[PDB]
Design a protein around this ligand. Structure first.
Ligand SMILES: Cc1ncc(C[n+]2csc(CCOP(=O)(O)OP(=O)(O)O)c2C)c(N)n1
Ligand SMILES: Cc1ncc(C[n+]2csc(CCOP(=O)(O)OP(=O)(O)O)c2C)c(N)n1
Ligand SMILES: Cc1ncc(C[n+]2csc(CCOP(=O)(O)OP(=O)(O)O)c2C)c(N)n1
Ligand SMILES: [Mg+2]
Ligand SMILES: [Mg+2]
Ligand SMILES: [Mg+2]
Lengths: 554, 554, 554
């Protein structure tokens, strides 16, 4: 009946519904490991704390739920900082649990103690705090979880000293609370909703744009009923893309990027409904190249700061994105008198197809495999039973041109942080979530980026996670090499070439299946063979460097 | 005449005497790359910003000079944080140069912008600041350098926005300053020095202990004259060890750890002179197991906080360690009437040898290679022309038992942060410095730890750096597995085994020479063959897990 | 044998030699108040925490020793922040002790809890920390004291939770340490000192400039011997001025400001020795108006960052200022062969006297009392037995013109923070220190500034502290009004007039003697009568607004 602080943590996690953790062992946090072992909660242990943190992200992003990461004092915490920052700008819900030096023997120059871990995380978390008494563990763990899961989602840090964790108390003297927090988000005032719907009804070329908060709550059947009653076409940023997979084809606009050529075609949108999509990198900042200056904008976001930050808007609503979608479907089931919109949907469709065909007529694979042709080979395997993870600059810019006409189960790309390497860990976490849902995970990364976490091939084999890692190999840090040539001069390249190393050989030495290909025919056969086996694999693809993707010109 | 902000940075670095930089490219910092190319200043580009950071540390520590790291905005900075924290606790002088988002278009949700990089670094740097005008670059770069190099040494962060760097100005309108800062440290008041020397003269069993600040200034000929005149035996922590290599053998006490058994032998030190060695992990905290409670203590440190932080002292002096050593030599050349001390030195010598012989009589290699026997094989190659770098827990605890009786050119081990993985990058940086001095670098690391940065084998081959990487392979995260068995129970091991992967195969796929050995004879032949070639190499050593090193009991 | 955490604090303060505290009561810190009552250590309780903090500053500045301030949780701490910031930029040694919410019942939304007080103080202290265990109180109090007192001096924050203070332990189980820290500062390398002295010997027009670090250590007899042997004239900023009071008249240059007119007179200094004086506001930034671009500069400062921050220098030394002065005296006693310098001292003297006479010939008091004439009246009472405190903008700029030819026991003016109002509390603390030394304190302040802390007249009467408060009353926030007229237009004055209120009437209602005067004759009689009484007093002086002081043009 006497129990440890580590037990208290794990009993609270169970009551909150968590089924998996991601981490790397240390003596400071061993009480949490022992408690998980007793209760049959698995911990996926990696080869780097960074990979563990990004895996918690991937699990959250692919499964639309909470992720949990577990690291030790000192370097255990500092190795987790890139994942924390990435989750902060992507609005993704992760609980980071960290060890730290004992409170008794504070300030004694001892092993792994002495860095102010809370101060380091303050600028990049929704909340960050250090626990002062063992009795407080259940209430504070649950409080941290409530902060992460509410709108807008984001990362939280709970710091647990090695004192506080090893301490033993009477289990009968401290209660474990339930997670009591409504699953339904708040919705707009009925007067704001009426105004929004009247604007939508009288528009000639209306458009919808989804962002990350739409993916976090995943209100698919409501979104479907709303789109079916109004006939309004829908676009998304990277993180919102998979929310379009269940819509009828005639209302699928794709990624926001191909709103670019609408102006030069006399087809600039009339009105745009932004649901959780911010003014920023993915939406063309304040330039008006995608969201026109002449259009009327309705914006819905849980954070008032974002409402028209870079551009004038017509109506600004603070509410939950899922709750709003839900309210739009309800009003629109009573209503049911909506103008046709068949011609406008055809126009949206025709413009996207024009971009695609234009790219295709310019891509050649004589004497070297073109990046666009390589992307096309992946695309024919993409559907509801697949999660796609994208890393590596030039690689994902080319890949995005084939992503609009297919319907992925999940799509996970870079956000605002834009940091090379986060892909490997992200994909590993996603595959853990996809197994319970019956789906396959595929990572598409660059030859530069894969090096950040190449050790994780060992983890894939140890844990038997059948992830497929595809490397687009152009012998260089690609986008950065392009910058030097384009912005400085043809003979001004330094520190950007990578003309060495057999990546498939490295995976083989760790016990995973390795392939090397260099054409449409060989790549096609290798991918089909990898999908047919229930095992991890590495496919090393020789690809040309010279071609410039349309998005790089912007 | 018209020049960029990047040009200004590089012209100032040259005038300060810097000859090498360590980094990873980004478009945000390209102006610094171009300027280095024009001036013939090499940039060593790695596969991870963490490895670049630790390389700057290694260059500084092995060469007794300034280290310089160079990283891009966003993830470039966040990937550098473990190196920054490590340098902070180790008191090592590194200038961290980082990019950031442009000041114009601040707060626009754009690529790689938005994280408060200065706030993140504040708790772990001597100084941290963001540059506001291109004109300020020379004076601020030089100010950052002065902060890093003065006592006690430490890391500094200079944040340079991509605005401020691309900007062009008239070279005639801003002046580049010299580095004007005395090379000699401040020294004690003559009355304090007299008091210290009178205490030393009347002691029966005096002892000296050196810390990191002795290595940073490297006053070797002065230390030699002082020890030769007084006959007082000298000990050191890990970072101070190489400062003992030029002393006569009769006054070499070795690492502080073997002061442990002095009390049970009626030989507890009478008086101890601490020169830059703090009360903390390496010196036994406040327990009195190494620095006795009954001894009189003289402490010299540039930070008043450290003076008797965990224990009562007799005399507390704030001054520079190098300046103090220099002042002790000068007073002791005039003086020259010192008591014998021959018997006491013999006693110190005999106790260290007793420890060694006791370990040796207990180590067996029947059916598996013993970690102590493997350390012995390395030891016969260690002298003035070699730098040894140590990573990986159980590995370095065993290795330390053979380090006192040899005389290394350099020795680089974990400090207070105690973070697995920092070794690979550290060793890479050290080898760059050793080349100009004509020395070889050897890294000794664990099978767990090597995985953190295994991609750097590629960098070794690309740059032709002949570093030898030795992996002590016990199929596990060793020390942590020991904790579970010893502190919880024999059947309570989880998350600590690593029974997969061919590490020598991985190095071979990156283009480096790979060996696998499992006995005294085979390991011996492989190491000799690797030293005979001017090329990088990996030696994978199968070693037993069960033996417990003496230090792990403490 | 059972004692409280509050007892532990006070027992440690006594052993460190503190004899007075400054504060304001709260229930959270009552254990400290009870302990002071048992041990006969007085606490000076004010009417505002800001006045308590500035009183700790004044006690430290006027007595050349440690100041100690005591405040309660929440608003107790936040009311103390202006004092903390002021001490940070002035390099003044104050220990700030603050209460905070109990660690048990952390994070319960309770009275005065919840603000991160350590994070608020981090950017403006040398050290700031929160105590985690009652046992740690003695070692951490003493550590805080060592940090405040070493070079360069500054403020420190120790946060003591209400939990940790009320807790009782066995007095026999925790030891109270001594304060063991040398009273002598570190000194330059003999080679740097020789170089400095050879430069000084061959100069034609050398000059010395003192700053705050010279006042903190107060090495008067050493300074006197050095100046007497070399014949080199000495200047100072506001904080260094009182260190000139014991020098022979022929070598007294005065405040650095009157180095201004030397260039137009063909007398620009040849060489300047800066002892703790920084490049900044008081020394003319990097403009070369006071410290010439053509001169050779030797700079001595404990912080390497300051060494030539805004201008090229010839020799840069990191050492203690007191230790350096001491070393200069010693070398100069053996030496004794120094060139005359009689002509050059006469030139320095003649230039200062020229400025004074020029001001005097321009000041008229027909129809209103001129600020210069009012300053002259105060000057005839200033000598070794008096401390002068200066506040309020136009007031202190006029006052400074009479300060060079007199020899004050102390002089306390604004530093870099330049914040109106800090004077009243500063003066109150100085008078506490002056009583044990047998000196009188006089505050000279503006009609705007006195309003910040006018309630302290009550404290003066309650405690019987015979401070004289003189108010220069020009019916306005003066310097700011001048700015509007001079920089914007004659009819652009708003928010700067203060044409209401009887300040002498307010002091009388609090029980202090009140006078009102408006001419040379009346002011003269009132001040003489106030000095003749052992009692606090307020003298309200009607003065003209229109005149512009020389320093305001700069
Ligand atoms: C952590 C980090 N370091 C550096 C950069 C700067 N950078 C922009 S793209 C790029 C590399 C792309 O290389 P690779 O992964 O091979 O993809 P490719 O463009 O060659 O397809 C680099 C270095 C970054 N975004 N993040
Ligand atoms: C960054 C970091 N530092 C420290 C730890 C905790 N830790 C203490 S020893 C150890 C690992 C030892 O493994 P290896 O590198 O093979 O050396 P061995 O002890 O097996 O010789 C770990 C993980 C951690 N988990 N992460
Ligand atoms: C706390 C603070 N508030 C405001 C200011 C701006 N300020 C500079 S001079 C001045 C006021 C001068 O008023 P007074 O005390 O009457 O002195 P006078 O100039 O009339 O001699 C003010 C308000 C400041 N420096 N600090
Ligand atoms: Mg590439
Ligand atoms: Mg191991
Ligand atoms: Mg006024």
């Amino acid at each position: 009946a006497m129990i440890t602080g580590g037990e208290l943590v794990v009993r609270t996690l169970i009551k909150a519904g968590v089924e998996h953790l991601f981490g790397l062992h240390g003596a400071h946090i061993d009480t949490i490991f022992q408690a998980c072992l007793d209760h049959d909660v698995p911990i996926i242990d990696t080869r780097h704390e960074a990979a563990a943190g990004h895996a918690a992200e991937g699990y959250a992003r692919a499964g639309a739920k909470l992720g949990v990461a577990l690291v030790t004092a000192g370097g255990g915490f500092t190795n987790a900082v890139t994942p924390i920052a990435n989750a902060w700008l992507d609005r993704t819900p992760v609980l980071f649990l960290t060890g730290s030096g004992a409170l008794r023997d504070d300030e004694t120059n001892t092993l792994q103690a002495g860095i102010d871990q809370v101060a380091m995380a303050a600028p990049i978390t929704k909340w960050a705090h250090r626990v002062m008494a063992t009795e407080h563990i259940p209430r504070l763990v649950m409080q941290a979880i409530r902060a992460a899961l509410s709108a807008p989602r984001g990362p939280v840090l709970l710091d647990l000293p090695w004192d506080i964790l090893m301490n033993q108390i009477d289990e009968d003297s401290v209660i474990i609370p339930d997670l009591v927090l409504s699953a339904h988000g708040a919705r707009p005032d009925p007067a704001d909703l009426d105004q929004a719907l009247a604007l939508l009804r009288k528009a000639e070329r209306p458009v919808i744009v989804l962002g990350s908060e739409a993916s976090r709550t995943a209100r698919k059947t409501a979104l479907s009923a709303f789109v079916a009653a109004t006939g309004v076409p829908v676009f998304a940023d990277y993180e919102g893309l998979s929310m379009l997979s269940g819509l009828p084809d005639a209302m699928r606009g794709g990624l926001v990027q191909n709103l670019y050529s609408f102006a030069k075609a006399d087809a600039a949108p009339d009105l745009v409904l932004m649901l959780g999509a911010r003014f920023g990198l993915n939406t063309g900042h304040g330039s008006g190249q995608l969201i026109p200056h002449s259009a009327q904008v309705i914006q819905v976001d849980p954070d008032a700061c974002e409402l028209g930050r870079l551009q004038g808007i017509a109506l600004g609503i603070v509410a939950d994105v899922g709750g709003t979608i839900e309210a739009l479907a309800q009003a629109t089931a009573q209503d049911a008198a909506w103008p046709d919109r068949g011609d406008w949907c055809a126009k949206v469709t025709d413009l996207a197809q024009e971009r695609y065909a234009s790219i295709a007529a310019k891509s050649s694979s004589e004497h070297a495999l073109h990046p666009f042709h390589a992307s096309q080979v992946i695309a024919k395997h993409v559907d509801a039973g697949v999660t796609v993870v994208a890393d590596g600059a030039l690689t994902y810019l080319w890949l995005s041109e084939v992503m609009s006409r297919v319907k992925p189960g999940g799509f996970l790309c870079h956000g605002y942080l834009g940091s090379m390497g986060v892909g490997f860990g992200t994909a590993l976490g996603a595959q853990v979530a996809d197994l319970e849902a019956g789906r396959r995970t595929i990572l598409v990364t660059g030859d530069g980026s894969v090096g950040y976490s190449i050790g994780e091939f060992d983890t894939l084999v140890r844990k038997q996670l059948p992830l497929i890692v595809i490397i687009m190999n152009n012998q260089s840090w690609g986008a950065t090499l392009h910058f030097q040539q384009l912005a400085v001069g043809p003979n001004r390249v330094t520190g950007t070439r990578l003309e060495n190393g057999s990546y498939h050989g490295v995976a083989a030495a760790f016990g995973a299946d390795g392939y090397h290909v260099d054409s449409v025919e060989s790549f096609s056969a290798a991918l089909a063979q990898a999908l047919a086996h229930n095992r991890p694999a590495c496919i090393n693809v020789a690809v040309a460097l010279d071609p410039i993707p349309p998005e790089e010109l912007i």
